[PDB]
Design a protein around this ligand. Structure first.
Ligand SMILES: [Cl-]
Length: 148
């Protein structure tokens, strides 16, 4: 299974892996002052990193199926998309581009939210033209999509 990470960047099982350098998650980076759920209309901005915003502290953007979005999160998170829980799908009708995530395969993916609420990834680079939807989340944890 792809590992989860605690708020201090330590792996909770398995072995640590580096993020892809082109991901929008840039580590090491603190997080977890508070769990802060936000709606798709109130995603955080870069300029919210040091001050937080009116909603709370900000460490970046986290997502899990539902969809549920967060601007900070304290529990276990993915640093890479757990592709064993995704499924190849056609490209959906996109509502928002939300970042560039490292797959559990080490590759770079563009991440999107679809009009159906699904979270979708598409290979950014070589091997590109692979598109998958996040269909299972058996450990009920988000991906850290962007850090601020
Ligand atoms: Cl997994």
């Amino acid at each position: 299974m792809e590992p989860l990470y605690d708020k201090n960047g330590a792996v909770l099982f398995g072995e640590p892996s580096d993020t892809h350098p082109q991901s929008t998650l840039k580590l090491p980076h603190p997080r977890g002052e508070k769990e802060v759920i936000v709606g798709i209309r109130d995603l955080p901005r870069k300029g919210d990193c040091r001050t937080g915003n009116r909603l709370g502290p900000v460490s970046g953007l986290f997502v899990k199926p539902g969809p549920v979005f967060y601007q900070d999160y304290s529990g276990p998170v993915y640093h890479r998309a757990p592709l064993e829980q995704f499924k190849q799908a056609p490209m959906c009708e996109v509502t928002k581009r939300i970042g560039r995530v490292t797959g559990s395969d080490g590759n770079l993916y563009h991440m999107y939210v679809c009009t159906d609420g699904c979270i979708l990834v598409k290979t950014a680079k070589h091997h590109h033209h692979h598109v998958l939807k996040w269909v299972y989340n058996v450990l009920d944890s988000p991906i850290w999509v962007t850090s601020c």
